[PDB]
Every structure is written in C-alpha cells, then in structure tokens.
Symmetry: D2
Subunit: 423 residues, 4 copies
C-alpha cells in the first residue's frame, strides 16, 4: 500500500498547460487536486510572464520558448513539462540553476512513425497518392506497370532504434524481408538481418527507410553516391530528421528514373506555424521542383501526429511531473540529477520527505544531516549534475511543530537552491 | 510434407493429325504466359491491345487457343469462324466477355483466374486503412500546393482499432491476417459460417459489425443482396468518425448516402476503388459528372481516397494471372485437363508413365445423349482401355480414355471413326 | 478457410437385391468403428480377439465387410469361402496379413490406416528427448528401490539442443514442429528433398546430421537402405554424449553397436520402442536373451528407455484408426468410393443430389481385358450415362457409372444382364 | 533491442588477496568468473564437516553454498573477513540471515534460475504419465513386455491445470499449448494470461475440467496440503497430479488412496515432506517417510529426487547469477537483490574520474550517523550518496571526488572509529 504525500505550505498546486496538451494530462493533473489552466495555443510573452509568476508547473510543446527572460519571473515553478521530444525551446542550464526540473517524452511517437512508414511503403509501391490526385482531377489512370505487392520485397532500415525495431516486426508481418544498417551491433527482432555496410543495405533493399538521429555523421548521409548504390526503381522514405537526405540529389535520382518513389515527412527548413503559403521556394529552393515529381508523398512532419501518440505523451509527462511534485522523483529529467526513493507504506506515520536542491559544493550534506540529526534518516539519496545537486531524505518521527523548524533551518542554508517538505 | 516426387517420368503427349499449335494472346497478357506457351512449342502471336471484329474474325479461323482479358468480346458472331479453337483463356476474373454457352456447344473450354488478385487487394486495404487513419492523401495534396497543415486531431494509430470485414472469402480472410498483424481487432460478417483465421470473430448481423468497427471493408460479390448494401441506414449504424473502404464491386456502396454521411461528419473517411460507372480506357477528363452524377461532389470531400480500380494492379498479380491461366490452357491442350473450366465438364486423368509406349489418349467431346459411350467403347474395343472418365455439363459431355497398344496405322482409323460419330462435337487424340 | 458447404444434400444410396449389411469386426477395433457402422444401419458382430480358421471360414461366408488388425490371416484358404464380402478393413498399418492379390481378383477392396499413429509417435519422442536429457527413467527407478540420487551432471535443458530427424515424413515433420516448440534446433536427413517445416534445415548427408545433432531420432520405413543404417560407423560420427531414439523399425539400429557406444561413454542415452525380435503376447519373462541375445546386457546399461512398441498405443490413435477405416469402408459400401484402397483401382464420383430421383449407380468390378466397357455401355445404352469412371489395377479394373431415369423394373434387367457378362468379377447397384 | 566510456574498476583500499570458498559443487561458471578477477578460489564438490568449515571460514572473504551447508551463528561467529554469502540455490534458511546482517554480511541467492528446467520436466512427465512410459521401461528392464493402449493418451486435446501461475507456471503455459494442451490456471490473484490460456475463478473449476494438474505455488500456510481428498474427489476420473514445487503442498496419504481407488491414474512427484540431506542408497524409505514403501508399490507414479532444477543450464545460470552478484558487491558497493540487507547501489565511475574514492559504510540504524559521516567527508565533494536501512542495520554508499593517498588512510581510520560502525570498506 502507498503513502500519499502533501507539500508543506504552498496551497493548491497550479499547473499551466499550453499548446493543447492532450486531455489525458488534464485528467491526471485534476485527479491530483491540482488547479489546471489550459490553452490551445502558445502565449505572447506578456500574457506568459503574467501567468507564470505564480504557477507551480508548466506544460509546453515545441513552439513555446521558456528562456531566461521568462523563467526569471517564475517564482513558484517547480518543474517544466515539455509534452514533445525536443527540449531546445527551454534554457535547460538556467532552469537547472534555479532548481527547475524539465521533462519530455522522447520515444512516445515510435508506433505512429512505424505505422506511417508501413502505409507509405504500400502507397509508394502502388502509387496510391498519384492515383487519387488523378481521380480528384478527373484523370482515370489504372496502372499495373512497376506497381508491387509489398510481400517479398526488402525493407532497408537505416537506424534500428525504437522506431526501426518496431517497424521491423510490422514489415515482416506484411511479408517483407528486413535488412538494417546501424553504427552499432543490435540484436535483431524476428528474422531481421543486420548488414555490415550501408552500401550492402542500399544494394539489396527495395525500400530504404531512415530512422537515425541528427548528427554530423547523418548530415546528408543519403546523397548522389548512395542513390547510385540503390536498386533501379527503389524507394526512399525519410520520417527521421530533415537533414538526413540531400533533397537535390533525391530529386535528381527520381527525375533520372533511378528512384521510383519517395516519402518525406521532414525537411531542412520547416514552417513555424501552419498556413497555406508556408511550403514554397522561399522556404526550400527546390520545393517547386520537388512538387513536380511523380510518386512522392509529402507530409507536414506528422510522423507522431496521432491521438494515441499525444495521449501517450500526455500520460508520460503528466505522470512524470506528478511524481516529481508528489514524491520528488527526477528520473528521466533532461537537466537534473535523477533521484528517487521507494514510496512510503502509509502506516509509516510521522515520516517526512526532505527535497533539497542545492549547489554541488563540499560540506552541504554535512550541514543538512546535522539539521536532520535529531531524527532517524530512514533513506537518503543525493546525486549531482554539473553545478547543482539534489538530496532526497526520509526522516522518521517528525511532528507538526518540528517540520517548521527543520524547514526553516534548511531554508537558511548557504548552498540552498530550492527546498520542499513532503508530509 | 512438400517433397520432390521421385516416381516415374511422365509420358509427354502430342496431338494427332495437327501441325504446330497457334496461340493468339490479346490485350497485353503478361510475359509469364508467353514464356510458358513458347516452352510448350506453341506458336504465339502477341498484341498489346484487342482487335477489331473484322481483323479478329480473319485471325481466329486458324487459331487453336486464344488468350484475352476484360475488353475482348468473344461472342457467337466471332466464334463461329473458329474451326481449330480448342480453348479460351481469360487472363482476368470476368468471363462475361465470352459466350460461355455457345463456346461449350462447340466444345471450347474456357478458363479464368478468379482469385489471383487476393494479396494485392488485401495490401491495398492495409495501406488505405493507414492512409485514412492518418489523412495522408489530404496532407500530401496540401504540400504539393504549398499548404503546411500538421494535424493530429482524429488521426489514429491503427493499433487497437477494429476492422469490420464484410465478406470473409479469399481477399477477406487474407486481409484478416494482415489486419491483426498491424494490430487491429477483426470482426467479419458473412452469409455463411466460416472458421475464423487467427483471433478474428464472426458476428451474427451486419449491424453488429457496423456498430463495433472503426474501419468497414467490403469484399463481397455482386449480387442482388449486395446491391447498395451499405446505404444511409448502415452509415447511421456505424460509429461516429468511422471509415468506409470499398475495393469490391461498384454497386455495393450507395455513393450519395456515403457523401451525405461524410458531409454530416458521420463518416470520417472513405477509400473507393470501384464505382457504379467506370471508363473503358485510361485518359484525362474520364472521371466526371457525366460518368457519375455525384463525382464533382465526391471529389470535394476531405479524406477520401479514390483509385482507378487498381485493386489487382500489381506486377505480381498479373504475373500470377499469366502463370495460372497459361498453365491451365497448356494442361488442357497437352493433357486434356478441364478442371477449373467455367463452362465445361471438369475431367482429368493421371499422367501416363514414360514406359507406357503405344498408349494413346482419346479426348472426345460429345452431346449428352444415351448411347454415345456404347458407340465409343465399341470403336475402342480392340484395345484395352487403361482408364476412362466421362462427365456431363448440361447438353455437352467430355470423355477421356487411355487406350494401350496402338500403332500409327490404328491412330488414323480410330480418329476418323470417332470423328464420324453422330454425337461428336470435337475430337482430339493425344499420342 | 473452412466454410459451411452450401450444396444440395446428398442422396443416400442403398444396395439393390441385398438385405441388411453384415459387418464382422475382430481383434478389438475401437468403438468409434462400431458406432459409425451401426449408424449406417449395418449389423455389427464384434470380437475382442481374432478367430480360429474353422470359426472364421463359417462366419465369413455370409459377411459383407470384415475388420481385422495384425493377427487375423486372411489367406486364399479362408477368402475363397466369402460369397458376399465386398471389402476388408485393416485397422492398422500392415496389410501383409491379407492376400491382397487374391482378394483383388475376387473384387474385394482392402483399406488400411497408414498414418494414424503419427501424432502419437511424435509425442512419444518429445517425452523421451526430455527423459533422456534429464535421466528421468533412472531417477525414478532409483527411488523405487530406495536410492536417492539428485544429479545435474550431464542432464540438460532440452532448449538450445539440436534434434537430428532421420526421415522427414509424417512423423518426422510433426516431430519437427513439436521439437522447435520445445526450443530445439531441427536438422533432418532424408533421401528426398523436402520443404522444411518451421525453421528446420535439411542437411545434404547423414554424417552432417550426426556430427551436429544432440538427439538423433529415426522415422524411416523398413527398406534394404534403412536396415541397420545406424551402427558403429554412424555412432562414431555422432557427438560425445549424444542420444539415440528409435521409434521406427526394429531393423534400423544395430543394437550391439549401440550397447558398444554406450559402454564407451560415447552415447549418453537411448530410447528404443522397436526391436529385431518381439514377443507375440504380453507377459513376464517375454523380453530376454532367448528373444534377443543382447537383452540382458542392454538392460544393464544406464539411461536406456525401453518400450514395448507402444509408439501408436494411445486411445486417440486407435480412435482415429476407427474413424479412418470405418469411414473408408462405409464410403466404399455406400458410394463405391475406393480411393485409398491398397489393392484396388482408386475410383470415385461426386455424390448425387437428393432430388436426382431414379438415378442409379452401377458398380462393376471386372477383368482388365479389352471389350468389357463395350459390353457394359451396350447394356446401359437405353439410359443416359451422367458420369462414368473406370480405372485398372493389374488384372482387375473397376467401373463406376451414374445412369439417369431408371425405374424399379429396368433395374433388375440391367443387373441381371451385367451379372451375366463374361468379364464380371463383382456387380453392385446403388439405388 | 539488445545492443553493444569504460568503467573504472575499483580495488579495495589497502587489503590482502581475495579468498573465495565454494562448497557443494557449484558450477564452473562461478569458478571461472571469480578467477577472472584474480581471486583465490577453493572449490569443494560436497559440503564440509563443522570442524573443517570453522577453520576454513575464518580467513575467507566470500563463501558460496547451497541447500545443505548450514551457516549458523556457531560458524559465522568465526568469520573474521566474511563480506558476503552466496546461496547458489533458492533457499536461504540454511543461513542465519539476521546474524549475518548484524555483522554486516550481505547474502544473495538465485530465486528464479530454475524456471525453464522445471517447466520442461513437467512436459516430459505429462507425456510419460499420459503413456505410463516409466512403467513400460521398468517392465522391459525386468523382462516383462506389456503393450498397453488402454487409458494411454495423446497429450494433444487434453487440459493442463496449472495451480500457481508464476515464473514456472507461466513458462509452462506456453510450452503446454505448443504441445497441444488447453491450459487452465488457478491463482489467488488476477494475472494476465500468456498465449491463449484462461484463468478459472475457483480451484474446483480447475480440478473439474483439467486432465493434468500441476502445482507451482510457494510453501505457505495456505498451500500446506492444499490438494487432499476433497480436491482429488473433485478431479476427473483417471486424472494426473504433478508436484514439482514444495514437498508440503500435496497430502501424500490422500494421493495414495486416490491412486489405490483408481481415481487418479498417475502422478509425478519431485518434492517430498522429508528428503535426505545427501545422496545415497536406502535413503528413501519408510524411516524417512512412513508411506514410502506403499507409494513405491503403485502403478504409473514418477518419483524424482528433487531434480527440478538439476540441469547444466540451470546450474550455469545460477553460477553466473550469484557469482556476478557477489563480485559486484565486492568490487562495487552493489547490494541489490540481497535477501538480508539494504538494497543499495550507485552508477559506476568513468575511467577518467581520477582520485575518486567510494565509501562503503555498514552501520547501525540510529539517528546521527550520517551527520557524523558527512562531517568526516566534508573536506571532499560528495558526488553521489545513497543510504538505506533494513531493520537494525543500514548501509551507506558515497562517492567522494578529490582524494589522494594520504587522505584515504585518514578517512578510513575516522570512519573505522565511529560509534555506529558495523563494517567499513573503501574502494579506490
Ligand atoms: N517524423 C516524426 O514525427 C518523428 C517522430 C519521432 C521520432 N522521429 C525521429 O526519428 C529518429 C529515430 O527515432 P528513435 O526514437 O527510433 O531513435 P533511437 O535513438 O531510438 O534510434 C536511432 C538509431 O539510429 C542509429 N544511428 C545513429 N547514427 C547512425 C548513423 N550515422 N548511421 C546509422 N545508424 C545510426 C542508432 O544506433 C540508433 O539505433 C530520431 O531522429 C527522431 O528524432 C521523428
Ligand atoms: N478492386 C479490384 O481490383 C478487385 C480485384 C479482385 C477482386 N475484386 C472483387 O472483390 C470481391 C471479393 O473477391 P474474393 O475473391 O475475396 O471473393 P470470394 O468469393 O472469395 O468471397 C466473397 C465472400 O462474400 C460472402 N458474401 C456473399 N454475399 C454476401 C452478402 N450479401 N453479405 C455478406 N457476405 C456475403 C461470401 O460468402 C464470401 O465469403 C469480388 O466481388 C471480386 O470481384 C476486386
Ligand atoms: N513405433 C511405432 O509404434 C510406430 C507407429 C507408427 C509408425 N511407425 C513407423 O515409423 C516409420 C515412419 O512412419 P511415417 O508414416 O512417418 O513414414 P513416412 O512414409 O511418412 O516417412 C518416412 C520418411 O523416411 C524417408 N526415408 C526413406 N528411406 C530413407 C533413408 N534410407 N534415409 C533417410 N530417410 C529415408 C522417406 O523419404 C520419408 O520422408 C515407419 O517405419 C512406420 O512403420 C512406428
Ligand atoms: N522442484 C524444484 O526443484 C523447484 C525448483 C524451483 C522452484 N520450485 C518451487 O516451485 C514453486 C513455484 O516457483 P516459482 O518460482 O514459479 O514461484 P512464484 O513465486 O514465481 O509463483 C508462485 C505463484 O503461486 C501463486 N500462489 C500462491 N499461493 C497460492 C495458492 N494458495 N493458490 C494458488 N496460487 C497460489 C502466486 O500468486 C504465484 O503466482 C515454489 O514453491 C518453488 O519453491 C521447485
């Protein structure tokens, strides 16, 4: 059985959710007794600074920029939830220096990207995109030439991680052979086979799919030589990062009848907001040329744009913020020492949890364990991350009177960054 | 279990009183058929399109087997001139383009490929389940015209959703296995009880399927009972925001009712491969209100996938069609095998051992009237009948017999005696 | 997938000029056979043992079908007295106890159950693979005599080991899927190329299987090439501490060599179900040096499992035999269907629709000489032959014909004429 | 899926050579793992007499035992240098765990390493009982040829009743279905079924509908003799009972009656209420268990000397599991998975983290101890620290950053002089 913990003082917890986090997060926060403010869009800096001064936790996504300019006004902010993969929109170092833990959902889009690729393998192999554009404009063009059953073909997976490995099992289920290249040796799932070099994957694959991070080594890793290494009439699918494919080379290989089709979800330059005129030659010089090619599927970075994906994002990040607020748990934080302890058995009464964010300088634990020396330390865990560190301690026989004293002593320590007490 | 049969070599048979076999293939049959036909020693004439009635009438008088597809119409008008035509291959599903009854009355067996498109249609629906669930068609049309529209609202991971398969036959049962592999629950309705594949579950009524499914797929034949079988009432029984896929027959969905359910936000997306009226040839401007009154309206709707009846348009499907029907025609010509014919008694016999020399196979198509076997087994009475099989299909019947100890002299005599019988429709001897 | 076959119900047929059918079942065939026969309206006489030659000759004179197993000897001596015997069922694999040639010359079709024991032998081997791997036989023998001997040395988890299957037939292929399911690697040697089940791999030579296998199991027929195919040379090619299982034939393993390889600690354990010489009846002292010289030495060895040829000794196996052979005889009695007969031309026709009234099925077993079908189709010439099939097997042949519009009066004439023909061996009409 | 800076291997501060004592014939994988660290290993195939053990344990740093060796306060009181105890088996009752803990000795075991071996064992015995193979082979070894098909079964189509759907049971489930069994399972908690197995609400439903009943439950007061007459009467005529769990779960007298009354057709027993401590003849008799000679007289009963986990693979996995655990506790502070000890560990240190020392502080769970320790360490940066308590003892692991050779000896003596100290080790 578990022991629910409360925060000494503070009053009700205030959550600010921006950019339309999924309702699963809203339900979780409300079920904690938190007060939730929800917005479907981001906020202008003025409205955001005003709303953030008294907020305890903020949930954002890709567009909201939490810089020092806005975080300096965050008086009560305990943690930040990024309900997405990227954390670049948050000044992680500054947030850490003020004891604000930041969380994300890194792998919540794996299934959605994998299902996307399965659909696009089939669409490219059958030219569904072109056929449907044709009928929507009156053209009847029944084509069986060079249209393929996906059964029996070979899928080349570049990057056999979270997405690649799930795509592997789906591809075999559809009857594909799976070859994968990766810069590390990975145990294959099902009947997939890893190949030593990229060129072997390119030579032997009918479908080439990219699921790699953005690194200097992945920058334009598929260009003219790599397209030349592929099979005549093979297919390229890129739902990874916009830098991984050299688009001019792809346009050339397609225009030269070397590549039979392509599906692009990511681009070197992408619009900051949705709009009618946003995808054009000013954004990417080759756009008007890319748009003129047959059997290219273009998607506005929708690799993770599903209800389920956002629902999983909601649960992971809301649960994470909930465990950090209610317990202290920082595991999985992107800028913060990863610290946690087993929850309390409910019957362990008069037990208090000390959450002490401080500077990573000698003597701090000396000070803190002195302050706590009149009580039995049941459990203690302290870890450091750069110039900050984080201490969790469970103390045994503490009554209401001595919580104020233990708290006020810790709040007066020289190395303190942030202190919370949990009942 | 599958093993290389290490028994006695078969005795390849050659037709009596004939020259080289002439095959006419129309409408761009796949190369797998041409290879099989040439490997039989046949003489193959190949055309990418059909033939006009005049040019076809002259060409068919000396043809032994004709290969067609959907467009070539082999009516009594043109078949009257087929003096040497042994069999007709339809390298497609439909046989309506052939006068099957007349072809039978002249002893011409017809073969088709009914189920060669199963895999291609099944994968088609999988891609379309995903495309509709993710709105791929709309997103991609948007980018080709400059519009950037990242949307996650009511775009779905397909895992955990329910596929409603209406018609659990060759395509449906194969779609079932693919669907579960993609993580869907599969429900199927059919007018017959069928053993489910994997963990699919058959439902008693159509409405139960419609109420419980997220994706509804049609894989039914064209019958009076399937005519517009999904219409306004059935869309009302479906889930809010459900998806309709029809890659079966163009009459099975009432399109005006579908358009209405889409405009009323009841149906979230639809994928149509077949239509009440379809063009006869590819071309621009072919798909419009003159073909189907509601086209301009259907085209204006969001998240609708429209395909020009490409459910079986794959290299593999056409390759299997080529192999299936060419093998069928070849075995009927070279052996006598009529199993799988659409207009003809289904008759065959085990091949003869290489060492069964001087054995001849009689292929005797005749009228289904008493006394014929009396005549035939009389004519054959000086030889031992090794095997014999005769079966009837309406007014015609077909006799295969293997008779032993036959020399060249006795082949001409047996042939003309059988060729002189009153009940004869067509006679071939295989030596 | 399996479907509710929607066709017209069949027209159950009853023999002309005969009364109730008399079935004689000997040697304790399973009750599933008795049930099927009684449900046909047949009269069933059942015995737990065979019959002495005197009682058998008298009882067989008026019996229509006889069911036997291994011990009943149906020779010419006793079959010459069988006036009404239409068919013989062997509810086992072996048919040597039946004079197949003589029975055929008198028009008596024989059926058996060749493969009904496949599942039982496969499960037997799985259980023995584990028992040999864990020395279960010994451990349990040990405690039954007071000895406590917990041993992990050289006892193995079966997961990860390699099973060598010699003979990848009915039993072997079923053993393959069970073995992989138990986590085994499967290699198989066979004199034929066979497509492997699951992820099994066929090896080119027997020695490759022997070198690479942890468990070697034999599932081969008895042939000159299989006699003693595992002896000292083959044991020398196996792995140190490998295992031999023989549930095939008593000739395939050289037991003195196996005893030699075990005593040299080369073979770690063995499971034997079959032996060069086996007792005729169950009893103590029956398995000894007089039966096989090496018995007393074989029993002295550790971790050898010995079973009294119980490979097919399950309720299910005997039940499947009951279903198989009783169904086979029933279809041959009720419909003429001789497919699967071991001594007889294999002949059958699609059954007739309930409504096809006045349709008669002619069953004509005869001598394989020219002119017979001339005669028969003469006799039937006043009626339309709907279907006819005749095949030959050595000196006999078998004619099935369905003839249309036949009344009670003209059935007796057709029968008496056919009964008078010179080539007749046996004639039955089904009405 | 599984995928391919190196850690800074730590050495105990100024100590001697490591001494490992391995008893009861532990698998060679444990010996190999220990020697690869340079440890000194003494190996024995059997246990040791109490006299020889007391002398040998005085100077040993780590001991590996199994079920028979009893490490009581009598023998552990002489353990001067004993840091940890490895139980290369499941049971730990043969060790006085509290006494070991009060002296700062962590104890480790291998709880689930035998799952596969017991599961395959039951498969073999399901088949052996379904065919009464044991009897047939005993018969031929004494000359009797008795070909029987009556009441012998193909296992396909039958129902396996798994009682206790835990590590072994769940693994048995998939194997049973692969063999063609229908699987029903009873357990006091709702558990997600593997494959197509189905949980039954009550034990009686499992007994009524199963052909083969197998027990995979812990030894608790609720399982004590849980299958007795009332249960056997609820089973099908000619059903089979397999017990490879604990010797108390089956009421053997009721089973003998059910076999004698032809109600139960066969049984396979691997565990027993009383079992010998060592292998030998005559050890399994009426003096050990009153009903032994009568149980042995029954047809189609498989008896095995507790060999459910007696496979090379299982013992190799036990060897790897426990030796790794003991090695990580010695070479690092890692006590996760110990049966008597606070579970404490920290991420290992990067090769490049020079002059870093790891403090391992066993102590009494009383207030003020951490006050003392972080004072002693206050001149150095605490990179990481973790302390947890377990009853009367507690265990502190700490990484300190800038420490030279001079400053280690002082840190050691200070911690070694503390009032609450039970055991202190420093890793350099
Ligand atoms: N389109 C979308 O909406 C969307 C959604 C989620 C993720 N993504 C992106 O897709 C990519 C894959 O995500 P994931 O979670 O599967 O990643 P991951 O970190 O789990 O796996 C990436 C794999 O790529 C391999 N790799 C790295 N560099 C490589 C190189 N140069 N060549 C070959 N292999 C290399 C790594 O070893 C690893 O196995 C990431 O870049 C992620 O940001 C896109
Ligand atoms: N789009 C294409 O290019 C393409 C290609 C091949 C086939 N098809 C068409 O798809 C359909 C399915 O082909 P198939 O080979 O799977 O057919 P099939 O004959 O194997 O199976 C059809 C199933 O529908 C069931 N059924 C019949 N009437 C029904 C009714 N009223 N309600 C419900 N179920 C009913 C039948 O019992 C059967 O199981 C056919 O009409 C075929 O022409 C289309
Ligand atoms: N022990 C029993 O009670 C019992 C029960 C049933 C069957 N059997 C016996 O088991 C054997 C197997 O039965 P089955 O139905 O599986 O047979 P099967 O006919 O299905 O298969 C036998 C296989 O052995 C192969 N083979 C033949 N000669 C070979 C050789 N020299 N080397 C390697 N492979 C060779 C064949 O190619 C074939 O694949 C038979 O002898 C049968 O009598 C025993
Ligand atoms: N024979 C051997 O050599 C050997 C080897 C290993 C384990 N075992 C024994 O086998 C048993 C199973 O081991 P495991 O590792 O799978 O155990 P486990 O702890 O993983 O699972 C036991 C299961 O039994 C259930 N259970 C407990 N009490 C129950 C009751 N009264 N009724 C029904 N279900 C009940 C529990 O819920 C649990 O699901 C243990 O007792 C273990 O000691 C014996």
């Amino acid at each position: 059985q578990p022991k629910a913990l409360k925060p000494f003082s503070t009053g009700d917890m205030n959550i600010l959710l921006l950019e339309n986090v999924n309702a699963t997060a809203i339900k979780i926060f409300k079920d904690q007794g938190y007060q939730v403010e929800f917005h479907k869009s981001s906020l202008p800096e003025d409205e955001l600074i005003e709303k953030i001064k008294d907020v305890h936790a903020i949930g954002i996504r890709s567009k909201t920029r939490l810089t020092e300019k806005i975080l300096q006004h965050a008086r009560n902010l305990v943690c930040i939830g990024c309900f997405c993969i990227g954390t670049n929109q948050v000044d992680l170092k500054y947030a850490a220096s003020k004891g604000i833990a930041v969380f994300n959902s890194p792998f919540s889009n794996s299934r959605s990207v994998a299902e996307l690729v399965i659909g696009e393998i089939i669409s490219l192999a059958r030219q569904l995109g072109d056929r449907s554009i044709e009928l929507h404009t009156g053209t009847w063009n029944k084509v069986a030439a060079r249209c393929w059953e996906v059964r029996g073909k070979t899928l080349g997976i570049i990057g056999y991680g979270h997405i690649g490995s799930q795509l592997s099992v789906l591809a075999e289920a559809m009857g594909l052979h799976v070859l994968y290249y990766d810069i590390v040796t990975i145990m294959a799932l099902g009947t997939a086979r890893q190949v030593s070099t990229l060129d072997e994957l390119l030579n032997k694959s009918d479908f080439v799919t990219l699921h790699v991070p953005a690194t200097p080594e992945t920058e334009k890793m598929l260009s003219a030589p790599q397209f030349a290494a592929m099979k005549d009439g093979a297919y390229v699918i890129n739902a990874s990062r916009g830098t991984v494919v050299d688009i001019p080379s792809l346009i050339q290989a397609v225009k030269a009848n070397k590549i039979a089709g392509a599906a692009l979800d990511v681009y070197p330059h992408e619009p900051a907001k949705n709009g009618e005129g946003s995808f054009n030659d000013e954004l990417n010089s080759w756009t008007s040329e890319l748009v003129s090619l047959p059997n290219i599927i273009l998607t506005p970075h929708i690799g993770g744009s599903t209800e389920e994906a956002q629902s999983s994002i909601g649960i992971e990040v809301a649960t994470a913020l909930s465990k950090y607020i209610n317990e202290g748990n920082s595991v999985g934080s992107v800028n913060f020492p990863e610290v946690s302890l087993k929850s309390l058995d409910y019957d362990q009464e008069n037990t208090v949890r000390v959450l002490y964010i401080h500077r990573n300088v000698p003597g701090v634990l000396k000070t803190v364990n002195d302050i706590l020396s009149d009580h039995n330390i049941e459990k203690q865990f302290s870890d450091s991350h750069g110039e900050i560190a984080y201490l969790m301690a469970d103390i045994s026989s503490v009554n209401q009177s001595e919580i104020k004293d233990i708290y006020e002593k810790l709040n007066q320590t020289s190395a303190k960054v942030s202190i919370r007490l949990l009942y």
